[PDB]
């Protein structure tokens, strides 16, 4: 049942943590696709965005605000990209909701 993010959350797998509160955790991606690449994850183990529900509204907004706050802290003033992958066609890696934040280089278009 638990994904590897369970170890990130319980600190049994050391990670470069940029932000933490009782709702979420932000840590660097160890397979980075940009000079800055971090993940914002809820502590509630919502597996994918398609499985979020109305009761998650506050949490989801909080994740976006934390993403943009952390982007500022990481010096992404010239721009960045937020990405959420759902399921196989979305190339979702781990089945625990995560927002990717990529910056520090020019992002291309299309976005994959």
Contact set with Cl ion (CB under 5 A) = 85, 92-93, 98
Query: Which listed option, a copy of itself, Cl ion, none, makes contact with residue 22 (CB within 5 to 8 Å by class)?
Result: none
Q: Please report, for residues 27, 82, 92, the alpha-carbon distance to residue 95 in angstroms, rounded to integers and kept in the order given.
A: 16, 18, 7
DSSP state at residue 11: T
Strand partners for 28 = 38
Query: Which listed option, a copy of itself, Cl ion, none, makes contact with residue 14 (CB within 5 to 8 Å by class)?
Result: none
**Considering beta carbons, is residue 11 or 91 the nearer one to a copy of itself?**
91
Pick the piece of the chain touching a copy of itself (CB under 8 A) from 6-14, 19-27, 80-88: 80-88
User: What does residue 71 show for φ and ψ, rounded to 5 degrees?
Assistant: -60, -45
């Amino acid at each position: 049942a638990p994904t590897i993010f369970s170890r990130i959350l319980d600190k049994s797998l050391p990670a470069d943590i940029l932000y933490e509160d009782q709702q979420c955790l932000v840590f660097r991606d160890v397979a980075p696709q940009a000079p800055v690449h971090f993940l914002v994850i809820p502590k509630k183990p919502i597996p994918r965005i398609s499985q979020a529900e109305e009761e998650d509204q506050q949490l989801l907004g909080h994740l976006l605000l934390v993403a943009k706050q952390t982007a500022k802290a990481e010096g992404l003033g010239d721009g960045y990209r937020l990405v959420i992958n759902d399921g196989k066609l979305g190339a979702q890696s781990v089945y625990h909701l995560h927002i990717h934040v990529l910056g520090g280089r020019q992002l291309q278009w299309p976005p994959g």
